[PDB]
Design a protein around this nucleic acid. Structure first.
Ligand SMILES: CCN(CC)CCS(=O)(=O)[C@@H]1CCN2C(=O)c3coc(n3)CC(=O)C[C@H](O)/C=C(C)/C=C/CNC(=O)/C=C/[C@@H](C)[C@@H](C(C)C)OC(=O)[C@@H]12
Ligand SMILES: [Mg+2]
Ligand SMILES: [Mg+2]
Ligand SMILES: [Mg+2]
Ligand SMILES: [Mg+2]
Ligand SMILES: [Mg+2]
Ligand SMILES: [Mg+2]
Ligand SMILES: [Mg+2]
Ligand SMILES: [Mg+2]
Ligand SMILES: [Mg+2]
Ligand SMILES: [Mg+2]
Ligand SMILES: [Mg+2]
Ligand SMILES: [Mg+2]
Ligand SMILES: [Mg+2]
Ligand SMILES: [Mg+2]
Ligand SMILES: [Mg+2]
Ligand SMILES: [Mg+2]
Ligand SMILES: [Mg+2]
Ligand SMILES: [Mg+2]
Ligand SMILES: [Mg+2]
Ligand SMILES: [Mg+2]
Ligand SMILES: [Mg+2]
Ligand SMILES: [Mg+2]
Ligand SMILES: [Mg+2]
Ligand SMILES: [Mg+2]
Ligand SMILES: [Mg+2]
Lengths: 64, 71, 76, 50, 7
RNA sequence: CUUUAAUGUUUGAUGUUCUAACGUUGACCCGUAAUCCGGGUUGCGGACAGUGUCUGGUGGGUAGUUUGACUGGGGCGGUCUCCUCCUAAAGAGUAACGGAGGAGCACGAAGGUUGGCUAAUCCUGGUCGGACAUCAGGAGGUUAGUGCAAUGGCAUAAGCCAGCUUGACUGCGAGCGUGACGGCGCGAGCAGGUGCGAAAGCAGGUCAUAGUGAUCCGGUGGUUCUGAAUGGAAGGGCCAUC
RNA sequence: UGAACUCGCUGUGAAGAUGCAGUGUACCCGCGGCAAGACGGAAAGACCCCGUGAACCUUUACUAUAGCUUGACACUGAACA
RNA sequence: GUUUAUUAAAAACACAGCACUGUGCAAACACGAAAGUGGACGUAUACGGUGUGACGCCUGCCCGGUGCCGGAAGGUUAAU
RNA sequence: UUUUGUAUAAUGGGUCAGCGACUUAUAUUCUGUAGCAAGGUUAACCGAAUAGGGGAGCCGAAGGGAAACCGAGUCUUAACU
């Protein structure tokens, strides 16, 4: 049987050009008023999954 | 929506690139409603592209090869 | 009244010692007060981090009638 | 915790707003400040203070 | 189960 | 209006009967040599009761589960996130149910900037006035102060006061620190647009270091980015926020 | 019942030794007897803790539910104040 | 009298007696999706449930809590 | 065997013989190897049946953006040094 995708991972990580994964930052969902504008601003753009986490991400996305 | 290469297009047989033609030449997909021509690969024979968005690059590439681009 | 508490260590200290060649913007010290004061080409941020403003070599000095420690950045 | 969240809204058309707190229990007067409004890209007046 | 072995 | 009182309209509503649905675990007749059942006749009830669907309440009667971890065994007690100092062996880091404390807020000024200013404590003198209130002088030299715990800073003040004020700006960010990670911190500089200053210049909150909660789901505003035949719309995305 | 050519003492040692070190003692093999040892046999400790185990039992634990109970509609009609 | 057949025979269970409380009979109650049946071919001097336990002398104070019983005006309150 | 550590007085085995525990399927990636190579390969099916037909499809030669879309660029932002 085909491996099944961890469908929640596929809603959170996207595979990119050199084979990595972009992902949205954490902490820009609510409780916003107290967080510095600077802080929030650097959380807007997306980011790469870390070296230590590619194991896990990739495990969750055979078909990425 | 699909993308087309300069590298294709010289292979539709009937120097006229349009959705059903590419499709026939098996380069896009039976259900594609829209397709662009990217500056990828070289283009050599002149050729006519009908009803296909075309990037700046691809336009130069195609036009230099003595081809036409009629939306 | 029951002890048991403490707080995460703040990794304060010298990050680049004398002679070290750093790029501009590079933290030279994480400190709490101003043990060190920014000298030439060295900045002082909010927490009193001293950072570099020009690329060059970390110099440590003692200047003034107060005899205060200063960190500067000389061009290499 | 007494202090209470409020929005400052842009006097310009733009629905833009900033966000902060105040001690309604003592400074009930609405809060009016000049803040940059990045839609009109001009320092305009901001109002309201819950 | 009843104290000494095996009462 | 302070609060009552006289017809309505219909509508149920409490109400009155009726009988014909329906109940009869009264009597009788026949199928029948039958305390079942069916039909019939009568008596008694009667739109009640009862049952179906929906619905509030009750419901250890039954059912399925939950009922944390650290711990000088376990339990009791205590503790669980964060901040400060010591233990920590003069870079970082570093354990214990080691030693001591603090936070889960506050401030539209207690933020910005320009100008200015400088404590504590003791002695001497001085109305009410006292060991200590305010006044003057000398000593003193930051032992004061810093919204708060500790530590480190602070006079060029970061301490104190006034004016003008919103930089407690939006977009970004070379380059660093710190983290297994999520992430967290510092940051010159660039662009727009601000305030204070004659100007050089300063300002992206507060002397710094606590003052906090991921993700999902949902709310509000913005924004045609998306829009399942097409145009719309719902819903979704994106940005702000709860 | 791993295999045995299967002694004492004092030490040592995964810390209570026939088997290790030192030393003492003892010719080879039975039979009748005794139970101080072989942490003797039997039974994967019942105490104790642990497992995000099991089962029953309890209750103003949670969540449901049979039952009990409330009303609305249906089976459900007529004539009068 | 009964009881742990196989480590407990007992002071435990039952018991006559007593008290509460339910029940108008198609009874309450109990086994049953139901029909049917026990209760009972009984009918409140009966039948069920609960407690207490011959008998003698007796069984006081408390209804706030928790249960239960009664209430109807307000308040709150379902489907509709 | 399990342990920081076992002659251990901790576990298992009276002895022998036979038997007794990392497999299989489909996905997926990686290494090695073979083929072909900007291409590679076909599935069901067809069949002259391990041939041949069948290119439906799948992977790859293009990315960036949530997306519209743009494209060797793209996004971010009014714009980026
Ligand atoms: C008054 C005398 N008693 C005290 C209770 C001595 C022990 S006992 O007989 O009573 C009982 C059995 C063993 N126990 C121990 O406490 C015990 C303590 O250390 C030890 N056992 C060490 C050993 O003796 C290990 C031995 O190899 C294993 C044994 C003897 C275990 C046998 C199983 N018996 C039980 O589990 C009984 C458990 C209950 C009865 C508990 C009570 C405390 C609740 O008693 C013991 O364990 C009791
Ligand atoms: Mg959001
Ligand atoms: Mg095709
Ligand atoms: Mg239960
Ligand atoms: Mg525990
Ligand atoms: Mg150190
Ligand atoms: Mg050291
Ligand atoms: Mg201050
Ligand atoms: Mg000044
Ligand atoms: Mg005096
Ligand atoms: Mg439609
Ligand atoms: Mg449509
Ligand atoms: Mg010994
Ligand atoms: Mg011995
Ligand atoms: Mg003998
Ligand atoms: Mg065991
Ligand atoms: Mg056991
Ligand atoms: Mg017995
Ligand atoms: Mg006996
Ligand atoms: Mg009775
Ligand atoms: Mg009794
Ligand atoms: Mg051990
Ligand atoms: Mg040994
Ligand atoms: Mg052994
Ligand atoms: Mg032995
Ligand atoms: Mg054995």
């Amino acid at each position: 049987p085909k491996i099944k995708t961890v469908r929640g991972a596929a809603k959170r990580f996207k595979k990119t050009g050199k084979g990595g994964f972009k992902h949205k930052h954490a902490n820009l969902r609510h409780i916003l008023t107290k967080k510095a504008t600077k802080r929030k601003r650097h959380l807007r753009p997306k980011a790469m999954v870390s070296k230590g986490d590619l194991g896990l991400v990739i495990a969750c996305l055979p078909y990425a | 929506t699909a993308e087309i290469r300069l590298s294709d297009l010289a292979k539709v047989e009937g120097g006229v690139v349009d959705l059903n033609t590419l499709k026939a030449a098996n380069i896009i997909g039976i259900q594609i409603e829209f397709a662009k021509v990217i500056l990828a690969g070289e283009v050599t024979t002149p050729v006519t592209v009908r009803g296909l968005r075309v990037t700046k690059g691809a336009r130069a590439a195609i036009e230099a090869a003595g081809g036409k681009i009629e939306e | 009244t029951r002890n048991g508490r403490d707080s995460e260590a703040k990794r304060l200290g010298v990050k680049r010692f004398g002679g070290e060649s750093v790029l501009a913007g590079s933290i030279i010290v994480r400190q709490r007060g101003t043990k060190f004061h920014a000298g030439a080409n060295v900045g002082c941020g909010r927490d009193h981090t001293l950072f570099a403003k020009a690329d060059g070599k970390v110099k440590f000095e003692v200047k003034g009638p107060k005899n205060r420690k200063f960190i500067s950045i000389e061009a290499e | 915790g007494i202090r209470e969240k409020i929005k400052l809204v842009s006097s310009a058309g733009t629905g833009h707003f900033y966000t902060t707190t105040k001690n309604k229990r003592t400074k009930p007067e609405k809060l009016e400040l000049k803040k940059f409004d990045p839609v009109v890209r001009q320092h305009v007046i901001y109002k309201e203070a819950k | 189960x009843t104290x000494p072995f095996x009462x």
